[PDB]
């Protein structure tokens, strides 16, 4: 048809681009929360491995 429909499509795609840009930083923030939780659970597992090694030998 003309310029009016194209201008509406541009605004629609622009509104979507703004949130996917924000969601990238939200994913990075949640990645850091998951990485600290990975480190917090290591001492328990390594110590249980150290006990079973002697308790079996």
């Amino acid at each position: 048809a003309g310029a009016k429909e194209i201008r509406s499509k541009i605004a629609s795609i622009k509104s979507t681009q703004k949130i996917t840009n924000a969601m990238e930083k939200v994913a990075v923030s949640k990645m850091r929360k998951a990485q600290m939780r990975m480190a917090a659970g290591r001492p328990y597992a390594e110590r249980i491995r150290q006990v079973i090694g002697h308790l079996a030998n």
């Binding site: 939780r37 917090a40 659970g41 001492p43 328990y44 597992a45 110590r47 249980i48 006990v51 308790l55």
Partner: protein, 128 residues
């Protein structure tokens, strides 16, 4: 006069520092551990662990059971986040069978492997 006590769980640390006396509820009776105690591995009951820090400070953490490992220069408490038990231990297993409510199990042959893997391999490449 003090040892390095570390109360830990599969998810995170509960305590870490220097202590003068550690009081625990063992599976065969209560214990009182102080510096230089002999090597000891033990099963813990669900209840509060009392610690004494140099001097007069008294930490009282509630633990749902676990394992106490002791050595003359280190005290490790491997706690549990939940209270394990034969009914709870079996119920979660039965609920994991029940949750897998599959009308038709199938065979596992899965001969469509390449047709599905290659379609997604090509599609995933075009997107980046």
């Amino acid at each position: 006069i003090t040892v390095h006590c570390d109360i830990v769980s599969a998810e995170a640390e509960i305590f870490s520092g220097l202590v003068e006396m550690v009081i625990a509820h063992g599976a065969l009776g209560d214990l009182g551990i102080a510096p230089g105690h002999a090597p000891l591995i033990t099963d813990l009951k669900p209840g509060p662990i009392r610690l004494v820090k140099q001097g007069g400070e008294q930490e009282v953490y509630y633990i749902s059971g676990g394992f106490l490992e002791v050595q003359p220069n280190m005290v490790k408490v491997l706690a549990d986040t939940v209270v394990r038990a034969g009914d709870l231990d079996e119920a979660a297993a039965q609920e994991a069978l029940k949750a897998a409510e599959k009308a038709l199990q199938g065979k596992g042959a899965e001969f469509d492997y390449s047709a599905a893997a290659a379609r997604l391999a090509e599609a995933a490449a075009q997107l980046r």
